[PDB]
């Protein structure tokens, strides 16, 4: 078995490192003073960077790797995305739903992620893609730590038995109380379906994930009720409010004073940029709205922001290879965080930040935890994500349960020359 | 007594149609191969178009044709108009609201109108123009089936003892239940108004009809609560909002979303172009909106809207004469419902689409239906509006209650010629 990782590169800090590994956990981190030899049980970082593992903490695997099916998308709306996913519905069963979760969290494994939050669409009486993602959390659990979140879709107050069908999710194992505000049929239900979600967390002890105002509304301030709660509770760490994109389109006063409650509260937000950019700003003729919430002022605030990829290859968003390095990079460039310290810090809105966001207990390069680690093939978060390289290793209790042999390209000019898109 | 109606079109029908008509109904309808000699006890429609009577969704009759008395608006403006009236309060007795009404109900049945909804206003604890109105209500019955609704213009919870002068107009025999909860002090007012109104209306199985969001204030949004509360009592169709001007100015985002639970709930919207065109935008300065409703929105959507004159002759509308072709065509103009089938299918806008708005139980050129219906000397909707046509007859129980002799134009060129303003 592994006993050491090493010529290890650390964000933030200066030189090589060597991480020594024992009984699946971290022993112990000592700095080198130059380049060690590689031997047997030792994996050679090969100067690269070494984090701890991608986080997916905002994804939809009970509809993901639909797209197409009967139909494709062909408007890319929402609205036709509905009617694309309805005509599938003769499809919609236990062990469809499973084989199409287990073919994207594969692809999730070969990207070092091993932490998702999955949504589970909880309005439908028969709970059938719930009690197949359960199954999947289990099978899936030795590669992947995967939290279940109850997703009352349709509303909890304005659709049919949806708090107790939210409940009934609860009981059967969720992870996580969603809610979807801006959804309900008037602004009270949507206040209101807040009170009683996070009623069930502290019934259950479970953590909350609130769709929250996902709409480019002006109006839409329940990410306000979701902070106050979660501080009079004393639950910030567990609560995440989702999206957020209204928040985009408010007056910076209001936003101002929302801010001061958003860091007294300590609730943690998700924006999905590939999915936001996309069905943002559709009401709009132009200019066009971006729709993204606001990342940049979050973390120059220290209120704990991250990023999801929401969707991946289905009548909402078709595209997608669940790449979180991509999604990254499609966030650093509509929240404009373009200076080379935002984006080389850019890392830690797919890795630390997600962490916190899922309440994770044992997560980071540390003495003690888990030896779950992955290694870039890249000096700093900068270069792995300028080049969008892949995962070369990725580690779990101390053994590799994913790797990537890179591409190789050569040019034919007089000689052939190997390019690896480095100056 | 009249057995037929001879060579009748149809609207979305092909060629010419006979009505057979027996005991004040209508017994059959047969299509004509060609057309069909007049006789005795035939009344023919001369190819021109038959539809059920023009409907007359909301309109005040308690202060029609008081402008100018004693002194004229001269502005135009509502705050002037208020103190026009007020200064005509010295002639506001029962008998004067019974010969005001009756003036304007004349103009209607010559329109060809059989069915009025009046609102009244009943924040006056001496309930004069009820009352007034209660006894025109049995007087017009032969010719116009008059709807009444109890109207709490000063507010239900912002006027002294408003709640019980509503709930008295129920006693007194009022057939709709009114509210207005823009014009309430506070936000919480008016969303307390609109539970109360619905619980009214359920105590005494009566309809509602509520003055929605009559303001240029993108913040007023009291309709998504008339839609929640008649979708959670099932009773959309006995539901209706009146105006909705305010959604003229909501962003778009919103609007989606408010559409889903205005189709699900099933509830009725009535436009009043005429009066919104003058009374809307009046806080603008350039550009100005329109502020009526989203109609087109409406019927592309399912959504089912009408429209009203609102006002005749009085401070607040100096206009009119109760025309409902008149109304329709300011609207289509005004929402930009110009295409050919748009302005063809007009007609529902003053037919189909009120009779439903107003419940009614009995409407419509069917077998099994009573014999109320009008012929317009038209080819068609288009036809019918771009002329501004009188109604050539109107019938009711089978019988004919208004005639109009169409006028007569001449030119006088190298020989006479007959104009009737057709290619
Ligand atoms: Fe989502
Ligand atoms: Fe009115
Ligand atoms: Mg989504
Ligand atoms: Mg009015």
């Known amino acids: 078995a592994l006993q050491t990782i090493i ?71 929402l609205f036709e995305g509905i009617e694309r996913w309805a005509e599938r519905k003769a499809l919609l069963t236990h062990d469809d739903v499973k084989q199409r979760a287990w073919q994207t969290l594969k692809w999730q494994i070969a990207n070092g992620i091993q932490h998702v939050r999955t949504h589970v669409d909880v309005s439908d009486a028969t709970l059938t893609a719930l009690k197949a993602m359960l199954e999947v959390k289990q099978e899936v659990a030795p590669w992947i730590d995967l939290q279940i979140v109850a997703f009352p879709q ?42 009683k979600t996070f009623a069930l967390a502290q019934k259950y002890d479970r953590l ?10 002006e109006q839409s301030r329940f990410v306000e009720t979701v902070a106050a709660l979660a ?32 860091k007294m509260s300590g609730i943690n937000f998700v924006a999905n940029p590939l999915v936001n950019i996309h069905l943002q700003g559709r009401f709009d003729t132009y200019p066009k709205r971006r729709g993204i919430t606001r990342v940049k002022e979050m973390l120059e ?40 310290g935002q ?33 870039l093939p890249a000096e700093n978060g900068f270069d792995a994500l300028r080049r969008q390289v892949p995962v070369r290793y990725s580690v779990r209790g101390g053994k590799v349960i994913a790797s990537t042999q890179p591409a190789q390209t ?11 898109y480095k100056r």
Chains 1, 2 share one sequence.
């Open 301 to 340: 605030s220290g209120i704990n922001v991250c990023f999801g990829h929401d969707a991946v290859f289905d009548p909402w968003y078709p595209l997608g290879t669940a790449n979180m390095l991509q999604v990254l990079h499609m966030g650093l460039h509509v929240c404009q965080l373009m200076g080379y």
């Open 410 to 420: 050569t040019v034919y000019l007089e000689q052939p020359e190997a390019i690896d």
């Open 7 to 77: 010529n290890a590169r650390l964000p933030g800090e200066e030189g090589l490192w060597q991480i020594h590994l024992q009984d699946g956990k971290i022993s112990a981190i000592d700095a080198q003073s130059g380049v060690m030899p590689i031997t047997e049980n030792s994996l050679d970082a090969e100067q690269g960077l070494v984090i701890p593992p991608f986080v997916e903490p905002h994804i939809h695997l009970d509809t993901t790797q639909t797209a197409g099916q009967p139909n494709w998308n062909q408007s890319g709306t």
């Open 208 to 217: 909350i994930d609130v769709h929250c105002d996902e709409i480019d509304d």
């Open 154 to 195: 349709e509303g909890i107050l304005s659709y049919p038995n949806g708090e107790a069908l939210l409940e009934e999710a609860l009981r059967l194992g969720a992870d996580v109380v969603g809610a979807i505000p801006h959804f309900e049929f008037t602004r009270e239900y949507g206040v209101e379906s807040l009170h």
């Open 343 to 375: 984006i080389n810090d850019g890392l830690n809105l797919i890795t630390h930040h997600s962490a916190r966001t899922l309440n994770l207990q044992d997560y980071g390069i540390a003495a003690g935890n888990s030896a779950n680690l992955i290694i």
């Open 231 to 262: 501080h009079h509770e004393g639950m910030g760490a567990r609560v995440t409010a989702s999206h957020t994109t209204a928040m985009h389109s408010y007056n910076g006063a209001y936003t101002s004073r929302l801010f001061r409650l958003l």
